[PDB]
Amino acid sequence: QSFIDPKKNWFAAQHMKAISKRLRRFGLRYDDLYDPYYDLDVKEALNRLPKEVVDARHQRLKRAMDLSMKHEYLPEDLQAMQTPFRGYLQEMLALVKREKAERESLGGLPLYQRTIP
């Protein structure tokens, strides 16, 4: 709406640089926080992506789980080379969700269901 855009609001342009600061020290992007175990639709958006794009995600996640075991951050040479908020996942995930809203208004079983634990 009107309280989340950072180039009009002042308190959204300080919430934006607070998450941008905290993502750079582990070298993560905002889309790496999306878990294929939380949402079964995120599992499908990653199977339609090229192999070289998913492999760079698995290597950013391993570099960051190694920095938090050792209790340290990326060195400041590598921290100026980081791009959080450069996305790879949001457009493919909106397409999978749009195809699921069409298969339900028209009848039709879901393509994948969650296992009951």
Binding site: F3, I4, D5, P6, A12, H15, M16, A18, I19, S20, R22, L23, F26, Y30, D31, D32, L33, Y34, D35, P36, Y37, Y38, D39, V42, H58, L61, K62, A64, M65, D66, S68, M69, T83, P84, F85, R86, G87, Q90, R114, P117
Partner: protein
Amino acid sequence: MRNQRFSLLKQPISSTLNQHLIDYPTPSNLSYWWGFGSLAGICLVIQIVTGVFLAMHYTPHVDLAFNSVEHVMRDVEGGWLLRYMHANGASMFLIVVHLHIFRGLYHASYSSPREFVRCLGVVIFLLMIVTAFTGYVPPWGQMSFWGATVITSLASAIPVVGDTIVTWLWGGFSVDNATLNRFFSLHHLLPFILVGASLLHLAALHQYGSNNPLGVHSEMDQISFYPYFYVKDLVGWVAFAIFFSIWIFYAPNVLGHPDNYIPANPMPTPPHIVPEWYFLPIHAILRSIPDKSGGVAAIAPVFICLLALPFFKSMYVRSSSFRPIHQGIFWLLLADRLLLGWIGCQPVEAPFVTIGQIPPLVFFLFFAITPIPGRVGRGIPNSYTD
């Protein structure tokens, strides 16, 4: 299988112990906040072993119950150690579980796919409250009588089958020997239900594994439980046994009330009826309503809004490390559960009637202002994008 044998830990007689306690894959960045769960299973074993030996010298009769506890303290070999380990050990079992629960709220451990792990633990917290309350009556002092009167009569505000509830729970017209005898039988039984509900609560976590301090998918960097998280859990079992030994040998009566050293007299009332420290937050919500039937109906929405946290969805970020606004609400709820515990040991007067009505409202505004970040937050990748 293979054609001949190999390591004996991979044999069927020890497979369930190998794959779940030795070779089990664990995230490599788990901190010391992931250590309070095995610490709570040691506190449950201490209470069972100490209580089985205490029950060889206790008599559940109103003419004989207070004098059986002084006989243990004075004439049984090492018997003062058996009682002080059991009375102070119920305070250690509640400190450890309270720090366990606040880990799961900070890192959002109730989320998918781990909803059944959260809901099996709300049942465990209910069995712990009934067991500690029902066991505080067997010493039969002035606070073991005037606390079982204040709580069991609170079911007399239920509609019009509730006057038949209280005289069936009591076994008569008051708290007396029919009530002390059935509170003893249920107190030997409920810790063994608590054991079977803890093994069931662990089979639900070994279906998906554990969460981590970053909140992410972690299957690319995982090590085994032995020796890495066994030797750092052992640092936690020795730091605990030092802290537990300054409560048995140097301050064994700080965490109790002096009024439980007077034998029970139903003709006078003590001046102030206060529970143990770990029941003080729900005791201040229960006395905050100026209607009594609306007081029982404010304890049941505490256990309803706990059981209905993991079923709101739209939150893809889990950990509070990357969430700067929900992180500030966590430290503002913890300041409210410590202020509700202070109010629960004060007189019912001014000014503690206003300062005890606003924190029950702030406590219930935590579970309604969680899902609104589940809506405003999912439009962040379409605005902050570079």
